[PDB]
């Protein structure tokens, strides 16, 4: 049995930690909702 608990407001934080790259990938999406790489 699942339950929910509040974790915070949804707001943009000025001067948040900036990380992560921006890859451009060819992908496929199957009927089960699973993404996979296309090569």
């Amino acid at each position: 049995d699942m339950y929910i608990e509040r974790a915070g407001d949804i707001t943009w934080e000025k001067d948040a930690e900036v990380t992560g790259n921006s890859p451009r990938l060819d992908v496929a999406l199957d009927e089960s909702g699973d993404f996979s790489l296309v090569e």
Partner: protein, 156 residues
């Protein structure tokens, strides 16, 4: 139960202790999460009950108490923020420039940030604080890294 707008953890007491299986967004009285988090099961909020209203395994999304309300989209140019809510840890904003998932049916924004599975459902926001999608359905690329789609539903 609690219906204030905001981000929420999705918990279960079925396994050892209390385990966080995911995250979701409450907006306009509707709770939005990813299908793989709840598998369409009913949810509890205090003494109240939330029943599923719409869901789709292929989109990997589900809404409770009403139809999907989130309709903002990534502009394809700007940095966004993942409002990550990891298991047992405080909510934290991470800013990033999304990459792209190119599919036979069009392009989708993607966030190259790696968090525990129980973080699935965390919202990705634009500079106006609007939810442009949920984090947690993606792919593992060559170097073993994780890249999530920016998954957004349709507002009827």
């Amino acid at each position: 139960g609690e219906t204030t707008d905001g981000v929420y953890r999705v918990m279960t007491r079925r396994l050892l202790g209390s385990t966080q299986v995911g995250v979701g967004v409450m907006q306009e009285g509707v709770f939005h999460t990813m299908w793989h988090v709840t598998k369409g099961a009913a949810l509890r909020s205090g003494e109240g009950r939330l029943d599923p209203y719409w869901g789709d395994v292929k989109q990997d999304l589900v809404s409770y108490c009403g139809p999907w309300k989130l309709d903002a989209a990534w502009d394809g140019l700007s940095e966004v923020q993942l409002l990550a809510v990891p298991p047992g840890e405080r909510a934290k904003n991470i800013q990033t420039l999304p990459g792209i998932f190119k599919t036979k049916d069009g392009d989708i924004g993607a966030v190259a940030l790696d968090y525990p599975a129980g973080t699935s459902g965390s919202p990705i926001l634009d500079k106006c604080g609007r939810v442009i999608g949920l984090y947690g359905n993606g792919v593992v690329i060559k170097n073993g890294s994780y890249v999530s789609a920016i998954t957004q539903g349709k507002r009827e």
